[PDB]
Amino acid sequence: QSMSVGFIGAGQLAFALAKGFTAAGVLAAHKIMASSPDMDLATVSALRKMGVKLTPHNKETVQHSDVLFLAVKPHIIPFILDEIGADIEDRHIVVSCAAGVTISSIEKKLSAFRPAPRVIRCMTNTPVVVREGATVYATGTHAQVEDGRLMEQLLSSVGFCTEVEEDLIDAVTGLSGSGPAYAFTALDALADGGVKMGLPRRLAVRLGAQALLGAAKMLLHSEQHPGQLKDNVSSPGGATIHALHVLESGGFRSLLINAVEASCIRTRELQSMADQE
Amino acid sequence: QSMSVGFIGAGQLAFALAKGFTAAGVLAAHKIMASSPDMDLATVSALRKMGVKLTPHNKETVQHSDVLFLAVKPHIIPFILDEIGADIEDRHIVVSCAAGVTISSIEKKLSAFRPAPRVIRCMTNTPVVVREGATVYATGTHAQVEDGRLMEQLLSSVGFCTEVEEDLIDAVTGLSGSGPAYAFTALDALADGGVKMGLPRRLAVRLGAQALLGAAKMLLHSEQHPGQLKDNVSSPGGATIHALHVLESGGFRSLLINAVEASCIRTRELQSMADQE
Amino acid sequence: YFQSMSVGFIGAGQLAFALAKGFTAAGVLAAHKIMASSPDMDLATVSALRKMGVKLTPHNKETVQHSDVLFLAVKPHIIPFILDEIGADIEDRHIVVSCAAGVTISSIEKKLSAFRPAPRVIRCMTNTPVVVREGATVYATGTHAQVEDGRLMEQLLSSVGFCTEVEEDLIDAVTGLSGSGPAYAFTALDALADGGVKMGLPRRLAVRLGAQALLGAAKMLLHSEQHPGQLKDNVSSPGGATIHALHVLESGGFRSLLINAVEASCIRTRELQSMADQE
Amino acid sequence: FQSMSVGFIGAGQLAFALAKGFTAAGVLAAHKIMASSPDMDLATVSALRKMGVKLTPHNKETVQHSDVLFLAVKPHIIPFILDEIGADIEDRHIVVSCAAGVTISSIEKKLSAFRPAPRVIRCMTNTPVVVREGATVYATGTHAQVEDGRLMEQLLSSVGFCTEVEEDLIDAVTGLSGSGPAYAFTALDALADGGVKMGLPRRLAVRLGAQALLGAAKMLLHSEQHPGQLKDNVSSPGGATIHALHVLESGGFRSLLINAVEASCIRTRELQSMADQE
Ligand SMILES: NC(=O)C1=CN([C@@H]2O[C@H](COP(=O)(O)OP(=O)(O)OC[C@H]3O[C@@H](n4cnc5c(N)ncnc54)[C@H](O)[C@@H]3O)[C@@H](O)[C@H]2O)C=CC1
Ligand SMILES: NC(=O)C1=CN([C@@H]2O[C@H](COP(=O)(O)OP(=O)(O)OC[C@H]3O[C@@H](n4cnc5c(N)ncnc54)[C@H](O)[C@@H]3O)[C@@H](O)[C@H]2O)C=CC1
Ligand SMILES: NC(=O)C1=CN([C@@H]2O[C@H](COP(=O)(O)OP(=O)(O)OC[C@H]3O[C@@H](n4cnc5c(N)ncnc54)[C@H](O)[C@@H]3O)[C@@H](O)[C@H]2O)C=CC1
Ligand SMILES: NC(=O)C1=CN([C@@H]2O[C@H](COP(=O)(O)OP(=O)(O)OC[C@H]3O[C@@H](n4cnc5c(N)ncnc54)[C@H](O)[C@@H]3O)[C@@H](O)[C@H]2O)C=CC1
Ligand SMILES: O=C(O)[C@@H]1CCCCN1
Ligand SMILES: O=C(O)[C@@H]1CCCCN1
Ligand SMILES: O=C(O)[C@@H]1CCCCN1
Numbered sequence A, B: 001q002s003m004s005v006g007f008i009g010a011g012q013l014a015f016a017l018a019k020g021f022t023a024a025g026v027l028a029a030h031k032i033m034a035s036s037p038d039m040d041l042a043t044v045s046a047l048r049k050m051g052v053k054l055t056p057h058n059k060e061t062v063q064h065s066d067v068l069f070l071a072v073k074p075h076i077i078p079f080i081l082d083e084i085g086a087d088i089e090d091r092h093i094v095v096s097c098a099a100g101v102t103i104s105s106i107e108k109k110l111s112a113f114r115p116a117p118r119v120i121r122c123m124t125n126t127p128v129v130v131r132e133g134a135t136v137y138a139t140g141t142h143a144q145v146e147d148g149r150l151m152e153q154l155l156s157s158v159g160f161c162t163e164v165e166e167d168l169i170d171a172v173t174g175l176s177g178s179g180p181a182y183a184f185t186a187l188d189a190l191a192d193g194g195v196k197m198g199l200p201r202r203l204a205v206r207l208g209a210q211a212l213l214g215a216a217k218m219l220l221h222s223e224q225h226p227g228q229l230k231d232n233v234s235s236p237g238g239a240t241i242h243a244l245h246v247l248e249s250g251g252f253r254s255l256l257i258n259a260v261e262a263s264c265i266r267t268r269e270l271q272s273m274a275d276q277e
Numbered sequence C: 001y002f003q004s005m006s007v008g009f010i011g012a013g014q015l016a017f018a019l020a021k022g023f024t025a026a027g028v029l030a031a032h033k034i035m036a037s038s039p040d041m042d043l044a045t046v047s048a049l050r051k052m053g054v055k056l057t058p059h060n061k062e063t064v065q066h067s068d069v070l071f072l073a074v075k076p077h078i079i080p081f082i083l084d085e086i087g088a089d090i091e092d093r094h095i096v097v098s099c100a101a102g103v104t105i106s107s108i109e110k111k112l113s114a115f116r117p118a119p120r121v122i123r124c125m126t127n128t129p130v131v132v133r134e135g136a137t138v139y140a141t142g143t144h145a146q147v148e149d150g151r152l153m154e155q156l157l158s159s160v161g162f163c164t165e166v167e168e169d170l171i172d173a174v175t176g177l178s179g180s181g182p183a184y185a186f187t188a189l190d191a192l193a194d195g196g197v198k199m200g201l202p203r204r205l206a207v208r209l210g211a212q213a214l215l216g217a218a219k220m221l222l223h224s225e226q227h228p229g230q231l232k233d234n235v236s237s238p239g240g241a242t243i244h245a246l247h248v249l250e251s252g253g254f255r256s257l258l259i260n261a262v263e264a265s266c267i268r269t270r271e272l273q274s275m276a277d278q279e
Numbered sequence D: 001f002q003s004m005s006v007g008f009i010g011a012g013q014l015a016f017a018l019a020k021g022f023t024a025a026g027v028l029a030a031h032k033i034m035a036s037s038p039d040m041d042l043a044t045v046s047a048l049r050k051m052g053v054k055l056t057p058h059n060k061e062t063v064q065h066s067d068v069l070f071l072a073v074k075p076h077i078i079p080f081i082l083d084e085i086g087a088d089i090e091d092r093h094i095v096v097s098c099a100a101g102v103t104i105s106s107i108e109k110k111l112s113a114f115r116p117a118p119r120v121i122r123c124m125t126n127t128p129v130v131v132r133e134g135a136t137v138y139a140t141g142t143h144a145q146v147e148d149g150r151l152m153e154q155l156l157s158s159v160g161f162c163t164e165v166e167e168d169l170i171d172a173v174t175g176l177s178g179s180g181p182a183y184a185f186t187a188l189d190a191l192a193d194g195g196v197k198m199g200l201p202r203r204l205a206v207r208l209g210a211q212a213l214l215g216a217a218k219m220l221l222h223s224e225q226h227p228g229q230l231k232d233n234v235s236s237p238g239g240a241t242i243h244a245l246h247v248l249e250s251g252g253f254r255s256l257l258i259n260a261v262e263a264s265c266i267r268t269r270e271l272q273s274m275a276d277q278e
């Protein structure tokens, strides 16, 4: 309750998490501060109306915060760590949200200034903004047991959250981190299919999104295999099995596997370049 | 509250709706009766444990019911209507859930026995079982205004529900009716992609489903275009835009359009055969 | 009982051989209580039937007079000529079992009813694995088949594999799945063997391992209540070799090709029978 | 062999499958079997419990209980396991590695640091051992005695086909019969969807497709004829089956199965190459 939260970066992810946290009630907007070198951002304007404290100065965010989220682009992380490293205290829990960036790389930058930085790495996604996020976290070398439990409590307020080994996170990034983009592409296309068959666009968007929401919820609430739930939809000779055939004829399943793989491979490739630098 | 509901048919759709209605609290299990010529069905066993009254005799379902759902396969509908047509009373609201079957065809069969049958046609989907269904309905020639409002009240308890013109329903069937099957295929494949990149299968299923649920919820709660929400996920040069490219290279969008179209075309084709018979 | 039943095959080809070998291997019938007829004795199937001890004759009337249960095992377009030829020889005691793809009970009963009013007709679809008593058989009973006729036919065909009664309107689809099925399987086993050879296995070992793998997986599914996707999930470890191989199957639309096959077989069956009904 | 104690290090899919097959075969009483795992909250551990298999978290307990010791852990866990119990391997032990890709030489090098001449056998099997129709190959290590191989072949023949091979074939066998059940399950799911599309109930389509594949596989195993000849026997000229074969050929059906065996084998070799660099 006395917990103060800070965001280095004031972009899409910082907005989504601050919106989710405040809607969840687990944090008052006034306990949150975010910093950015650009206050002319739509997300900065939104955070202001929410009641989040804003500043150009990353040092002010550090000084206000107990839990410090790093919500900048991955290549900005080392610059950020050099800038505020001398201002980290024993009270701080540093939570990196950046795609690809390793706990090792973060702990090495911070340890030059003060031993035993408490670091947690997470991967989440934009649906935390409607409290339906998918989040994983890995705890660092000096994180205490209460640090992981605190972070799971906080991130569970805005969706699914579980601890993982760090070597799983790049793959999670390709699945649930990039996942919403696959869904939005799919929903746009399903709506176009509805329009082609005679539905108004607004209705098609609503129906397609509601269908995907409900099916996903069924699977999360069921112990059955997704193929069994699929079997339950189709009648023999019917419309649904005819539609499933044309998906299969296009290699639909393989394209989704291709996407998760391509995201994960790019994440690893980018971090290799960072480590080489 | 005094309303009694009956299901002709005791299969996947009847279970899903009865489960959703009772979980919603809008109906007590004991106000529901369902009939089937086969009590050795898993769905019949499930309905029994819920507290739903079961019978082999469709006439008993009619006699108990105020609202009567037709939840049999489309080709069974005319047989069903011939069987119980003499038992429909002025109190009855007949709600056909059957894919493709027209209000005209139903009103013609029932009108031979008694004038002015009150008929509503709906299309829904299995996620009503977790109260996240997508339902549309069209009112028949003799349905009263309170009949449509009653049905929207009832079906809104288990998900989205809106009135449509009947000529939209076959297209809705290809989008949200068959939709859950597209989602389950997609979730199975996304999980395989997670497994390929090193995630345990149970975790990949959970993450993929949670990602699709959250993205769908974002779109339902946003006024923004799905392409804008997609743009918000990707950073320049990043993992997500790399993954979106490989989806595009496979014609991912076109496959989903193909599916909605194929389902809708099959539905129309099947009903043409029924009308020819 | 069963060994006292006389069985006849009109047609002495691949299906008659497969069934006669299955029945005799099962011990339900003595080979010499089977008679088969063909206008062509220079077939390999006739020679094999002869070596088993089946009675062979060129005269379909002899097969009819010999038999109690009479299997029609000729090509579908031959059935109406067969029915014209021996229809007058069908007796009240006969059970007539059509194995021909596509041919309807109605077409058979219309021919035979011109001779006697209540011909007992059963239609079945089976497959060549009856030869190792692992066939997949369905049957539908005709207008005049007694309840005991269906029970007898199920007992007989269960001796050489799986057997269940179905409505007749399912049989063309069954034909595209389990009737044509063994050919899809032999194609797949030939290709899996080539895959083993490409990766360095001797052909003989690759053939045996591929066939054992498919047999064991199919038996697993038949003995499990789990979805095939779940059994599939259990084979793969994260990042491992099996999931990499499943991806390249998916990239080629592997699933859609098998759906295409069942559909193509069933559509061709319906199309041929429509030409027969037109003729 | 009633004087034989079998142990599993690992209590996952493969250990369950083998234990269920051995016990169903009657060659082992379930109480003569011990399995270890650091995680007792697995579905496979509960199933092993109900069978009457002894469970323990301690790999050393499994080693002390067992004469034949199956390594049923993921390949990257093998070197850790060997470090943990290498000092407990006795002369009596036969160590049977089931792990994909892991070489006899790598196992022998680990165990030899503790006691010379470890008796090592490498095998590749598959999950259908659970219905006693597995396909297993094995290779004997440097110090395996002649009777060690014969004993293993007797034990593994009780749950399916089993033959000795040169070790350099095992990665390819892994891509064919090791991964093979997954190809079949994919095919059976798809064939069932095909049956449903043409009007069959799903339960019936699943049963018929599985029976068709089982019977055709048995036909081939029992026949001296080429699979092409058995295929030819199914088709009549102009008929339904040859029409269906054509659409398989037009999609390169054969090439996809070759692709799968190749992709599995290449990945196995790639993974072990990384293990050997580490
Ligand atoms: N957008 C998404 O869907 C998700 C993004 N992420 C991660 O979140 C991090 C940020 O992602 P987005 O918010 O999408 O980026 P974004 O580009 O919307 O916001 C980036 C923010 O960093 C600020 N910034 C740049 N230099 C700075 C500095 N020196 N000090 C402080 N702030 C600075 C920018 O002004 C902007 O406010 C990335 O590492 C990304 O991998 C992870 C999960 C999902
Ligand atoms: N499964 C789905 O996803 C949805 C299905 N529907 C529609 O719901 C209707 C039923 O669909 P499912 O429940 O999936 O079918 P289902 O096959 O699971 O259940 C069909 C039920 O009808 C019963 N039945 C057969 N003959 C009968 C008779 N003479 N009298 C009474 N009951 C009889 C069967 O025994 C079975 O209980 C279909 O028209 C379908 O289009 C619509 C929305 C979604
Ligand atoms: N081969 C298979 O895998 C299966 C075939 N079937 C059905 O079995 C029937 C026969 O198929 P196959 O045995 O494969 O054909 P096949 O061509 O091997 O043998 C056909 C037999 O009919 C004989 N025949 C031709 N004219 C005749 C006549 N007037 N009187 C008597 N016999 C005559 C031929 O000489 C030959 O012995 C077909 O209707 C086919 O659909 C059904 C299930 C599987
Ligand atoms: N599943 C299959 O279809 C086949 C698997 N294999 C091989 O069998 C081995 C196991 O495969 P699955 O059983 O499928 O894996 P699985 O993941 O189902 O079970 C793995 C087991 O290892 C246990 N484990 C992890 N660390 C351990 C440790 N330090 N000490 C003891 N147990 C530990 C886990 O708790 C789990 O019980 C792999 O090397 C695989 O290549 C070979 C043939 C077929
Ligand atoms: O495949 C079918 O016959 C049905 C039609 C309606 C929505 C669900 N699936
Ligand atoms: O495209 C990107 O850079 C990020 C990576 C992490 C998840 C969201 N998208
Ligand atoms: O996918 C895997 O890791 C294993 C390899 C061995 C055979 C079965 N599947």
Ligand SMILES: O=C(O)[C@@H]1CCCCN1
Pocket (backbone or CB within 6 Å): C101, C175, C179, C180, D234, D235, D236, D237, D239, D240, D241, D242
């Ligand atoms: O190709 C054919 O004509 C037959 C039809 C029946 C099943 C087996 N093959």
